[PDB]
Paper text:
The [name] ([name])•tRNAPyl pair has proven itself an outstanding system for genetic code expansion. The large amino acid binding site of [name] enabled the selection of over 100 ncAAs, and it is the only pair whose orthogonality and expression in both bacterial and eukaryotic systems are well established. Here, when we attempted to evolve a [name] variant for efficient 3-iodo-L-phenylalanine (3-I-Phe) incorporation, we unexpectedly obtained a variant that efficiently incorporates Bta. The two surviving mutants were found to carry two mutations at positions Asn346 and Cys348 (Asn346Gly/Cys348Gln and Asn346Ser/Cys348Gln) which we named BtaRS and 3-methyl-PheRS (MFRS), respectively.
To understand how BtaRS discriminates the Bta molecule from Trp and other canonical amino acids, we determined a crystal structure of BtaRS•Bta complex. The crystal structure of BtaRS in complex with Bta and ATP was determined at a resolution of 2.1 Å. The unbiased Fo − Fc electron density map revealed the presence of both Bta and ATP in the active site of the enzyme. The first mutation, Asn346Gly, creates a flat interface in the amino acid-binding pocket, which shape complements the shape of the Bta molecule. The second mutation, Cys348Gln, enables an additional contact between BtaRS and Bta. Apparently, the discrimination between Bta and Trp depends on two other residues in the BtaRS active site, Val401 and Trp417. These residues form hydrophobic contacts with the Bta sulfur atom, which would be impossible for polar and hydrogen-containing indole imino group of the Trp molecule. Thus, BtaRS discriminates Bta from canonical amino acids apparently by four residues in its active center – Val401 and Trp417, which are also present in the WT [name], and Gly346 and Gln348, which were introduced in the Bta structure by mutagenesis. Compared to the 3-I-Phe bound in IFRS active site, the BtaRS•Bta complex shows that the carboxyl group of Bta shifts away from the ATP binding site, leading to an increased distance between the carboxyl oxygen of Bta and the α-phosphate of ATP. The Bta activation by BtaRS reached 2.4% of the catalytic efficiency that [name] displays for its cognate Pyl substrate.
Numbering used by the authors:
A (entry chain A), B (entry chain A): 188 to 207, 212 to 378, 385 to 454
Amino acid sequence: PALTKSQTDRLEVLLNPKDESGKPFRELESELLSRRKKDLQQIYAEERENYLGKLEREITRFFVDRGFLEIKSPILIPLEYIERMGIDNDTELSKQIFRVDKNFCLRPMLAPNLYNYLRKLDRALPDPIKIFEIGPCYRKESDGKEHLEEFTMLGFQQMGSGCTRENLESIITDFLNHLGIDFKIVGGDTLDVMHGDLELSSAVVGPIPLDREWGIDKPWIGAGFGLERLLKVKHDFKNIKRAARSESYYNGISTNL
Amino acid sequence: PALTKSQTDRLEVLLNPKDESGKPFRELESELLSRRKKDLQQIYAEERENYLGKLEREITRFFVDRGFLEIKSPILIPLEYIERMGIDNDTELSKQIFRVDKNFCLRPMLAPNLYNYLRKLDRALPDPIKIFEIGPCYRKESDGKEHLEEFTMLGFQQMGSGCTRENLESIITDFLNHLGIDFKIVGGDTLDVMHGDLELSSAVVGPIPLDREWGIDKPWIGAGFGLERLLKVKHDFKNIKRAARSESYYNGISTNL
Ligand SMILES: Nc1ncnc2c1ncn2[C@@H]1O[C@H](COP(=O)(O)OP(=O)(O)OP(=O)(O)O)[C@@H](O)[C@H]1O
Ligand SMILES: Nc1ncnc2c1ncn2[C@@H]1O[C@H](COP(=O)(O)OP(=O)(O)OP(=O)(O)O)[C@@H](O)[C@H]1O
Ligand SMILES: N[C@@H](Cc1csc2ccccc12)C(=O)O
Ligand SMILES: N[C@@H](Cc1csc2ccccc12)C(=O)O
Ligand SMILES: [Mg+2]
Ligand SMILES: [Mg+2]
Ligand SMILES: [Mg+2]
Ligand SMILES: [Mg+2]
Ligand SMILES: [Mg+2]
Ligand SMILES: [Mg+2]
């Protein structure tokens, strides 16, 4: 007979994008279970690397080799940083903040910490100043197809000379062509890097009025990329949860076998 | 005249371990400022890697090469995981938890997530099962010399065959000798890896009664290492804050120049 909706959901959990009727549910499930176990066995036998960790290391190598300084800043940040970013109750992000204690929150973005590093490093480093960070960011989200509440962001910034829209688009282009990800750029200037209807990045060509609140008075360019969305596109995951920090999926493979 | 306590504090911020009277504060400060700027310039010109990120990549390579599977699990975990770990109000850790919303918290440890992966991977992977994770952990702490509220932990576990105290001590020994860190092991069995009076790790030889609550019924060995404490020892930092995710220090160098 026909597969139930619940049975189809179960199979889709076990179904990989590269997988290719009269067979009952138990046979279809048994076949997929066998395939997914072998996938995990192959990873365990060979590379043993996590997709998220591996992507972070690859992105790190890319930006270090292009002269960007690797930053590891706090994930737990002051609540005042959020207000200082021009985030008031009349914006969407104000309601998306994970508050911790009275004075802190989980960072929903990388810009405040990177802003602070630009200002401080300006007193020590030659022009131009190039920095980047990869790490966890947190936002309360209502959706679940393209959004995670716990995700990983790449953020990079260049300050001083060479901060043009052309140079920014060049870095973005080299980056995504390096990863093998198809894209289009749509758009101080605010640009969005799109994969179909999926936003991979928001990019900015400074200066912008916000800079003054952070002690920045130089031209700058930068962008923020979601690593899970990059993984989702590269590995053709139907749902972004396959690319997340998770106990339910490893490298897009269901751990409930 | 004599340096004030405040002036000495200022200098100690700028002072590096490898640095070597009648000179006034302003001269001493100016000399150190010049040295620290050059240090940052040298990093920026050459390697451009963050110590914490670099250590994580080195540790990752070590365990992957020895057959351990790289795990990236959620940092935001259910509060029930804490209770299930046998953490009640009569223990110290109960008061150290960063609570988020009503049902979640920032993980103070890696064991609950690694426990879950051991159980799930047992249905797919051959014996023995070897996994590890590196990532942020959070604990409210009263001290500040050897403790951070936001820190990074290495956790590894092996389940099944070869789970002996000897094998556990062998992995620990090879690991720390690889990093070039002096240590002594002091001590199911609970072992502590010490550097002088500083605890680098707590290690465990299972099985332990707690395993049943997590669906584990096999022998296992494992340990948890603090990456910032490893950095502190390796780079001879006087205060652990020099090794933390920070806006005040980069690779042990003050960013307030
Ligand atoms: N909840 C989330 N889950 C996964 N990735 C995210 C999330 N929020 C943002 N990102 C990624 O971070 C990048 C930069 O953050 P930004 O604030 O510009 O996103 P956004 O415009 O809020 O995204 P969206 O419009 O899709 O909600 C985005 O391009 C996206 O790839
Ligand atoms: N607050 C902290 N800051 C930095 N590192 C930590 C912190 N708490 C734990 N660690 C590291 O994690 C490892 C394993 O965690 P564990 O719970 O065994 O530590 P602990 O016994 O609470 O440490 P301590 O006794 O020093 O407070 C420790 O050996 C330590 O290196
Ligand atoms: N608004 C997001 C993404 C972003 C846009 S420009 C930019 C420059 C540096 C880091 C992040 C970003 C953030 O602040 O993380
Ligand atoms: N209690 C700490 C450290 C630890 C001891 S054995 C162990 C095995 C795996 C992961 C972590 C640990 C934790 O749960 O993270
Ligand atoms: Mg959004
Ligand atoms: Mg958007
Ligand atoms: Mg955007
Ligand atoms: Mg403790
Ligand atoms: Mg202890
Ligand atoms: Mg301990």
